[PDB]
Amino acid sequence: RFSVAEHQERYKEECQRIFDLQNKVLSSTEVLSTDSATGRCLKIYRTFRDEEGKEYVRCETVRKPAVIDAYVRIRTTKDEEF
Amino acid sequence: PHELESQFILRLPPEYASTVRRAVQSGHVNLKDRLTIELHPDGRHGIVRVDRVPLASKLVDLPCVMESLKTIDKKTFYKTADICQMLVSTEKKFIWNHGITLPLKNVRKRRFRKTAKKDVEKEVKRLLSTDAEAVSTRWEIIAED
Amino acid sequence: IIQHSIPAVELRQPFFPTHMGPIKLRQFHRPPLKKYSFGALSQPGPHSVQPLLKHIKKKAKMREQERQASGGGEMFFMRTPQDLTGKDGDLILAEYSEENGPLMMQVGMATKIKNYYKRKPGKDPGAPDCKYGETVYCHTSPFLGSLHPGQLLQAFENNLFRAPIYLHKMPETDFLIIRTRQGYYIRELVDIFVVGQQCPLFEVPGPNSKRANTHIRDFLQVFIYRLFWKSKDRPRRIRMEDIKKAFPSHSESSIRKRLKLCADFKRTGMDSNWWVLKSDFRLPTEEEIRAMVSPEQCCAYYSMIAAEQRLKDAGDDEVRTAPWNTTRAFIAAMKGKCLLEVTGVADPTGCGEGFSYVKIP
């Protein structure tokens, strides 16, 4: 169960093989042909006053995970600040 | 003070490109008249005239970062400018998934890693602005159906 | 050994930014095409490109005459930003396979191409002639993979990193256009070098590292000394607002602490609202100012802030991929302190090709 000699030999051979492969792919002149965890969306209800007297309510749904994660993080931070 | 020079690659049709390359080698003022570049206010599009013929052009973003290097003695190289944009004369169309070199092709879906777009943060800022405009903001969660 | 251009050693603000905005950090070494506020290009319409082939030959002839004046000995001609411009001289293009380099040279930095050749066993014909760089012979390959005997690989050699380069012909369709406020300019490009994964010879500082904090303090102090040299007043004086414009991120109190030593403030009389240099203090010489902050240190700091911005934008694997961890791991491998797993999440390609710089027992 050699721990140092076996490990060093495998590391050296793998690095050399990758170095040869990386050089070959980049040096090649061959042409190449063109080729949430919860699973829950976020919905927001906004209440605003329109011109003169009105109180319309707008419901907007975000189905994009990255936007949902950013919005939730900011909302949680705002709650934490107060 | 000093403003860094901005360099963008220009791509032309091969028959058009060959005529332009011969004119560049000649260095004649005729080449200056023959080739004119016009930049749109958006800047994602360009109009290029080759031999006094207008060609529709769209600016595209090179995926890789390319640096121009100048060497007086051919042993020491000094960087002049960085090129990340190419104008092609004949969004996902404003992006180029292919490298300029033949080896680097389909780099975005091969020799590149999955990277964050940031964009998305700006869209969240717009949502925050609408929340501020609204007198009342209500939050609810909808499960996928 | 490497000599940087006089603007690059002087850490001039256009070449090296005092501060970078979050959008600027995302666009690292990838500048958008700007629209000039004023100038011929700013006015809407077609703009004619200008041939500078005669200019390139004349500038090269002038440089050769200056070398003849020096006796034919090699001469450093990059003493000004105008010299740094790519319109004159021979231009080569380098394309990086990695989407983001762990260390990226700032504009005006210099690199020497080194061609590494391993001799064939017993008698060998010799190293292949190379148009760019100087051929050298090494018993052991600098790269982790051993070079095969009879094989020569060109590489970019600089203090920040060493990266293998492969020469490829430029496409006939491709042309290089340099755009300036006065007019567009066109240069044909014939040679482009593909760049292999960079092997870091320098260490990127971690966010909030003691080294990173020292570099930030040194950069601010060096800028303050340069401002005193810039002032033409016999009692050198600088405005606090000018330093604040250069460094919005820096707190006024941190700038005040640097100002507290070597400068004094008058609210009344002559030099009112000015930070006058202390008479007792002696302003540091230009060589001392260059010694305090290295261009390599600035590039590592610039890489760290851009990587930190990317990490912040993307909400442990990503932390391993970050350059400061990779640079430390590669230096440890050269020391032999720890091995690096060849295959890891840190690999830039995301495929078997390329190496991952992650520390392993």
Swiss-Prot record, chain A:
Compartments, as annotated in UniProt: Nucleus
Post-translational modification: Phosphorylated by casein kinase II in vitro.
Top-rank taxon: Eukaryota
Domain comment, as recorded: The Bromo domain mediates interaction with histones that have acetylated lysine residues at specific positions. The second domain also recognizes and binds histones that are butyrylated and crotonylated.
Disease: Dystonia 3, torsion, X-linked: An X-linked dystonia-parkinsonism disorder. Dystonia is defined by the presence of sustained involuntary muscle contractions, often leading to abnormal postures. DYT3 is characterized by severe progressive torsion dystonia followed by parkinsonism. It has a well-defined pathology of extensive neuronal loss and mosaic gliosis in the striatum (caudate nucleus and putamen) which appears to resemble that in Huntington disease.
Family: Belongs to the TAF1 family.
Subunit structure: Component of the TFIID basal transcription factor complex, composed of TATA-box-binding protein TBP, and a number of TBP-associated factors (TAFs), including TAF1, TAF2, TAF3, TAF4, TAF5, TAF6, TAF7, TAF8, TAF9, TAF10, TAF11, TAF12 and TAF13. Interacts with TAF7; the interaction is direct. TAF1, when part of the TFIID complex, interacts with C-terminus of TP53.
General function of this protein: The TFIID basal transcription factor complex plays a major role in the initiation of RNA polymerase II (Pol II)-dependent transcription. TFIID recognizes and binds promoters with or without a TATA box via its subunit TBP, a TATA-box-binding protein, and promotes assembly of the pre-initiation complex (PIC). The TFIID complex consists of TBP and TBP-associated factors (TAFs), including TAF1, TAF2, TAF3, TAF4, TAF5, TAF6, TAF7, TAF8, TAF9, TAF10, TAF11, TAF12 and TAF13. TAF1 is the largest component and core scaffold of the TFIID complex, involved in nucleating complex assembly.
Protein name: Transcription initiation factor TFIID subunit 1
Gene name for this UniProt entry: TAF1
Curated annotation (Swiss-Prot), chain B:
Top-level taxon of origin: Eukaryota
UniProt PTM comment: Phosphorylated by CIITA.
Tissues of expression: Ubiquitous.
Location(s), subcellular: Nucleus
Modified residues (Phosphoserine): S129
Cleavable signal peptide: none
Task performed by this protein: The TFIID basal transcription factor complex plays a major role in the initiation of RNA polymerase II (Pol II)-dependent transcription. TFIID recognizes and binds promoters with or without a TATA box via its subunit TBP, a TATA-box-binding protein, and promotes assembly of the pre-initiation complex (PIC). The TFIID complex consists of TBP and TBP-associated factors (TAFs), including TAF1, TAF2, TAF3, TAF4, TAF5, TAF6, TAF7, TAF8, TAF9, TAF10, TAF11, TAF12 and TAF13. TAF7 forms a promoter DNA binding subcomplex of TFIID, together with TAF1 and TAF2.
Similarity comment text for this entry: Belongs to the TAF7 family.
Note: Overexpression of TAF7 in HeLa cells inhibits cyclin D1 and cyclin A gene transcription and causes the cells to accumulate in early S phase. In contrast, depletion of TAF7 from TFIID complexes by siRNAs increases histone H3 acetylation at both cyclin promoters and stimulates cyclins CCND1 and CCNA gene transcription.
Subunit structure: Component of the TFIID basal transcription factor complex, composed of TATA-box-binding protein TBP, and a number of TBP-associated factors (TAFs), including TAF1, TAF2, TAF3, TAF4, TAF5, TAF6, TAF7, TAF8, TAF9, TAF10, TAF11, TAF12 and TAF13. Part of a TFIID-containing RNA polymerase II pre-initiation complex that is composed of TBP and at least GTF2A1, GTF2A2, GTF2E1, GTF2E2, GTF2F1, GTF2H2, GTF2H3, GTF2H4, GTF2H5, GTF2B, TCEA1, ERCC2, ERCC3, TAF1, TAF2, TAF3, TAF4, TAF5, TAF6, TAF7, TAF8, TAF9, TAF10, TAF11, TAF12 and TAF13. Interacts with TAF1; the interaction is direct.
The protein's name: Transcription initiation factor TFIID subunit 7
The encoding gene: TAF7
Residues of the full protein shown: 9 to 187 of 349
